[PDB]
Amino acid sequence: FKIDRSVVEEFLALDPDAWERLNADYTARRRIGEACRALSRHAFVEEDPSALEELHDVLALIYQQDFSGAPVELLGCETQPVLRDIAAILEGAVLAAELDSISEEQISAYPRSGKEYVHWLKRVIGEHPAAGHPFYRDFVPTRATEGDFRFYLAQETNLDPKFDDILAFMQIGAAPDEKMEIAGNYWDEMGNGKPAEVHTAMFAHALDALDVNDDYIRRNLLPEAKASGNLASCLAISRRHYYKSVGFFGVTEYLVPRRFKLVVDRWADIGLPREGIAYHDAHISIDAVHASGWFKNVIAPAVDRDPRVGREIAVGALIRLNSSQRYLDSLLMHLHH
Amino acid sequence: FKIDRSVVEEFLALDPDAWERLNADYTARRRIGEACRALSRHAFVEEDPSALEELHDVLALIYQQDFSGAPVELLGCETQPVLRDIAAILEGAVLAAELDSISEEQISAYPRSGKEYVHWLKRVIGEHPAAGHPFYRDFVPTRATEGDFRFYLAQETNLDPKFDDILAFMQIGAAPDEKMEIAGNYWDEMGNGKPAEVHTAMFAHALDALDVNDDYIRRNLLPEAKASGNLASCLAISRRHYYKSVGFFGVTEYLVPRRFKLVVDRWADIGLPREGIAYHDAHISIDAVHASGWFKNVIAPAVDRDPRVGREIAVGALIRLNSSQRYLDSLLMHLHH
Ligand SMILES: N[C@@H](CCCCNO)C(=O)O
Ligand SMILES: N[C@@H](CCCCNO)C(=O)O
Ligand SMILES: [Fe+3]
Ligand SMILES: [Fe+3]
Ligand SMILES: [Fe+3]
Numbered sequence: 001f002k003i004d005r006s007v008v009e010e011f012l013a014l015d016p017d018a019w020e021r022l023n024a025d026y027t028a029r030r031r032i033g034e035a036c037r038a039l040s041r042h043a044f045v046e047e048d049p050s051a052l053e054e055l056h057d058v059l060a061l062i063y064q065q066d067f068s069g070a071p072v073e074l075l076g077c078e079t080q081p082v083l084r085d086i087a088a089i090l091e092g093a094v095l096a097a098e099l100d101s102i103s104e105e106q107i108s109a110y111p112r113s114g115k116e117y118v119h120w121l122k123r124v125i126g127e128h129p130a131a132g133h134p135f136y137r138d139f140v141p142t143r144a145t146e147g148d149f150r151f152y153l154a155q156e157t158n159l160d161p162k163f164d165d166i167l168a169f170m171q172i173g174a175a176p177d178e179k180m181e182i183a184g185n186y187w188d189e190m191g192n193g194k195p196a197e198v199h200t201a202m203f204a205h206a207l208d209a210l211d212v213n214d215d216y217i218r219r220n221l222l223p224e225a226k227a228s229g230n231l232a233s234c235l236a237i238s239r240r241h242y243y244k245s246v247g248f249f250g251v252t253e254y255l256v257p258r259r260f261k262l263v264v265d266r267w268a269d270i271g272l273p274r275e276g277i278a279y280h281d282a283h284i285s286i287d288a289v290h291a292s293g294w295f296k297n298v299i300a301p302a303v304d305r306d307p308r309v310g311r312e313i314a315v316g317a318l319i320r321l322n323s324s325q326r327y328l329d330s331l332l333m334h335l336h337h
Numbered sequence: 338f339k340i341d342r343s344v345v346e347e348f349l350a351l352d353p354d355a356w357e358r359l360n361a362d363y364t365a366r367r368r369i370g371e372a373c374r375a376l377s378r379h380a381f382v383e384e385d386p387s388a389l390e391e392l393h394d395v396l397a398l399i400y401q402q403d404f405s406g407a408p409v410e411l412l413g414c415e416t417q418p419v420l421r422d423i424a425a426i427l428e429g430a431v432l433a434a435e436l437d438s439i440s441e442e443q444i445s446a447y448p449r450s451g452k453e454y455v456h457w458l459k460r461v462i463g464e465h466p467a468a469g470h471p472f473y474r475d476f477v478p479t480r481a482t483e484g485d486f487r488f489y490l491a492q493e494t495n496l497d498p499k500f501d502d503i504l505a506f507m508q509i510g511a512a513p514d515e516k517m518e519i520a521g522n523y524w525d526e527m528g529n530g531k532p533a534e535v536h537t538a539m540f541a542h543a544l545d546a547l548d549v550n551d552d553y554i555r556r557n558l559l560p561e562a563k564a565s566g567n568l569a570s571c572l573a574i575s576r577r578h579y580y581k582s583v584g585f586f587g588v589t590e591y592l593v594p595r596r597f598k599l600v601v602d603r604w605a606d607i608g609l610p611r612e613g614i615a616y617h618d619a620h621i622s623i624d625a626v627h628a629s630g631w632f633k634n635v636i637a638p639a640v641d642r643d644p645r646v647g648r649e650i651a652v653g654a655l656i657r658l659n660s661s662q663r664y665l666d667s668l669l670m671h672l673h674h
């Protein structure tokens with residue numbers, strides 16, 4: 001028995017009674033889990049590229065179920081016993097592979113107090129090549145065309161369209177100072193109550209401006225872009241990944257202003273529609289504030305409450321930096337060719 | 338093999354390697370699932386009261402893991418394959434029992450348009466005895482002592498302390514009008530950015546005022562109060578229960594002002610601490626606004642988008658009304674004796 005995205009599409013087409021029968025059959029469920037371990041081995045031991053893409057296509061479909069409004073025809077289907085077992089197996093393998101790129105020295109010599117930890121982490125971020133990647137520093141300002149931006153925005157659908165729900169998942173159960181900062185960030189994402197200013201709405205306008213339609217996205221989404229989006233989903237939805245999420249999305253907010261300023265300036269130079277760049281233009285100042293509040297009110301209080309979490313925050317920051325590097329190197333490699 | 342709360346406490350004490358070994362053993366996992374079906378049968382077929390309380394003690398512990406900040410020692414433990422299978426089995430039985438009390442005529446003759454559906458649902462709510470329950474209408478204004486209120490507030494820890502995260506879970510993936518209303522409600526719950534005004538913080542002050550400490554809660558929490566809190570958790574955390582949640586928490590907001598006005602007036606008459614009633618006092622006007630916005634901006638747009646969801650919203654409203662009735666009848670029965 002082999003598992004791939006089409007096998008899971010078939011599961012999601014089952015009616016509520018068929019799901020109940022599957023959930024009651026632990027032999028069928030053992031076989032599904034074994035098929036996931038086999039796929040995980042092809043993807044990360046053999047490092048077969050088609051198995052790696054298949055694995056992230058499967059995870060992406062499962063997270064679609066976690067993040068999307070359920071359709072009426074599926075409201076009676078108990079998908080958690082099977083889908084959560086699949087996700088646990090594939091996630092475990094994705095994260096073990098990320099951790100293989102992270103050394104213990106990288107995540108252990110931090111200062112064990114909040115304000116000092118923030119300075120250390122900014123330095124650690126600044127050492128990493130993703131903090132000044134040539135896609136943004138070099139290619140965008142000098143070469144990027146409308147078709148380049150269209151391809152780039154297709155990759156960016158991996159994360160930006162669900163950022164408000166990432167934050168909503170993250171703040172579940174969070175301590176007060178951290179929760180209040182994440183909550184204010186989420187409220188900004190929802191336009192502070194004004195529909196026109198909702199961030200996902202303005203990002204959708206950028207997609208419209210370059211005709212980044214769903215078929216173009218499906219055909220052009222890079223495997224490393226899918227991995228990036230799956231890592232974001234993986235970390236946000238589990239309480240036990242909260243402190244990794246703190247580092248992962250802290251790095252994200254921190255790097256947006258430098259990256260988006262480059263995108264916005266080029267977008268203007270080549271005369272692309274002003275209406276389409278409102279999202280990126282707005283985030284240049286918004287995420288300078290978000291990044292400042294995230295360090296001061298999420299990271300520093302967490303470390304001050306329990307310095308042991310500085311190691312988890314550092315791992316999440318490095319997972320974001322490493323996965324962003326692989327994604328941007330792959331993107332820049334496809335855009336050159 | 339029997340499953341109870343202490344068996345699941347033991348699972349949660351396992352280290353990450355022991356969890357990995359358990360997750361890989363589908364024979365052990367088949368036995369856990371079979372033990373859950375056996376407990377479910379004792380609880381809802383035999384209707385054994387100790388099995389029913391044990392079942393909700395198990396669910397409550399699992400939802401604690403979904404809703405609480407994870408402790409550092411547990412960050413490496415993959416609990417989803419087993420805990421989600423347990424929850425699916427016990428939840429399926431809890432909800433089947435709720436649906437046994439709901440007739441098809443109750444959830445099918447609604448008008449298939451939003452504004453009209455709102456009037457229908459308010460009428461349906463008004464027919465149900467929980468909408469004017471004697472605990473609030475009769476006992477509170479005339480008899481409730483400080484010890485009665487202390488016992489009551491212990492029961493209310495089933496829901497109020499996690500209402501902000503219920504809303505955050507609920508709005509995941511929601512359509513824009515509905516999402517923006519839920520988001521504004523959540524932001525109100527977080528004091529609109531002012532820590533002193535965060536609703537869970539002010540509820541904690543009410544608990545402090547009557548010494549509703551964790552040991553008192555543990556010893557006094559009624560089985561129907563646990564069932565109420567578990568139903569709230571169950572519906573909020575699954576995307577497929579979104580439309581039930583819309584009805585369940587819509588009824589909740591709608592009934593708060595009448596109930597809390599009775600509580601606040603009695604609390605004053607018997608001279609209890611003014612500082613302790615700030616939460617309930619504030620919610621009298623807050624939830625009149627929340628209830629109005631919930632009907633207008635959540636329920637009516639959902640029904641207008643797809644009238645089929647009026648049946649799910651109605652089921653969730655009746656689950657809230659029925660479970661509130663059982664809880665308040667049990668509470669009033671213990672307070673009389
Ligand atoms: N996709 C962009 C950042 C996305 C942040 C979302 N803003 O709320 C990047 O990778 O830098
Ligand atoms: N526990 C109360 C309502 C709780 C609503 C929370 N307010 O944000 C009741 O059962 O009426
Ligand atoms: Fe944003
Ligand atoms: Fe931001
Ligand atoms: Fe509230």
Ligand SMILES: [Fe+3]
Pocket residue numbers: 522590623624627
């Ligand atoms: Fe409210």
